[PDB]
Structure 1
């Protein structure tokens, strides 16, 4: 099923047919090559091609395993920015894509998990190596993920406002504004805080946060 022949030709064919885009046959060849040439002269390049193939072949979890193998294999490589960006991209791609994408359904009030993980990964990347080539789009992704998380928390606060549990709403929106003070979600969530204070018979604080609106009338 595989030719046990000198390595030069198998590497050459591997890069050539990955260059074609034959991932279904490239992943097997690359994994067999790596498992039979564990410490070749440039096995790092093999591992990076494995990352590329796994991501493009949509086998994200095994790609994640390869990422956390490579990071511990050599925590100091002159190309780790690419690996970190690929890890963050894997998280984000795993997070949100479904029939809602065709339907345009707002994926805000869904399970964050992967969103938080992706934000953490991208933030670690950008705060690590600002001189790299993967900072701009990374920063845009940070902004988008922050907006998504803020919208999720706003949605849950809105449901609690719909119910009438006028304490948990205060805690949730307080956490929002403590964590996410520079987003639209707090901007439309502040009136929920005002309503909760007014309904809670403790209006001594209510007008207080009302003054907040007085500073952002626009």
Structure 2
């Protein structure tokens, strides 16, 4: 009785009985996969797979929802969930890169979403993680004297993760790599960047566009 099965699944989700809720929701999605309530069932299944730590199933279900309903009113929430799932898969920064992309795509689509604030919080951690990885790579390239690869990695950190501890730590690798190449205009630029990067991070959550 699909309406009572649905009400039942909703209670199971509220109890945190992920396994039973997944069962009943999958059977509904089997039976009416393009029914009037199918997007509802799929959103709840996304959630239940995530909470049950079925992360590959959550990820696949998110991708299918986005493909099939690219303009849905709850897309903001589906991309929040895609960030959470990829972030859980991270705990080889592939999953962290996917989460950064998800959440940054969320913040630049729905700057007014209820999930805004938590996505921005998670982005601080992600940017820290990804910049640390890129710093390790820049160091390795330094060890090799691969000065052009050093400059490429650091400028990517400065472009994408400008306010992180790792980009701070990596700027002198970049100034060095240019100097090693006798590239004075470039090296002096980095020296400028370093002198000016305050630990004071700027806030613009109170600005609306």
TM-score tier, shorter chain, comes to 0.7 to 0.9
| 1:137-156 residue CA offsets vs partner (Å, 9 max, x unmatched) | 11122222222222211111
The one of the two structures with greater contact order (alpha-carbon pairs below 8 A, sep at least 6) is 1
Structure 1 unmatched runs, 5+: 1-5, 97-110
- Matches of 1:54 and 1:23, distance apart in 2: 8
Structure 2 CA distance for partners of 1:202 and 1:176, relative to 1, 3 Å? same
User: How much does 1:209 deviate?
Assistant: 3.5
Counterpart pick for 1:175 among 139, 156, 159: 156
Alpha carbons of structure 1 residues 209 and 24: separation in structure 2 relative to 1, 3 Å: closer
More off after superposition, 6-15 vs 51-60: 6-15
Change (3 A) 1:163 1:49: same
Encode CA deviations 1:62-96: one digit per residue, 9 max, x unaligned: 11121122223333332222111111111111123
Runs ≥4 residues deviating over 6 A: none
Q: What is the alpha-carbon root mean square deviation over aligned residues?
A: 2.6
Show structure 2 runs of 5+ residues with no match: 200-209
Kindly tell me the number of residue pairs found equivalent between the two proteins: 199
Show the 5 A alignment for 1:5-44. Answer: 6-44=1-39
Bigger radius of gyration: 1
Larger deviation, residues 14-23 vs 162-171: 162-171
1:128-178 Cα shifts (integer Å, max 9, x gaps): 112221111111222222222222111111122234444432332233334
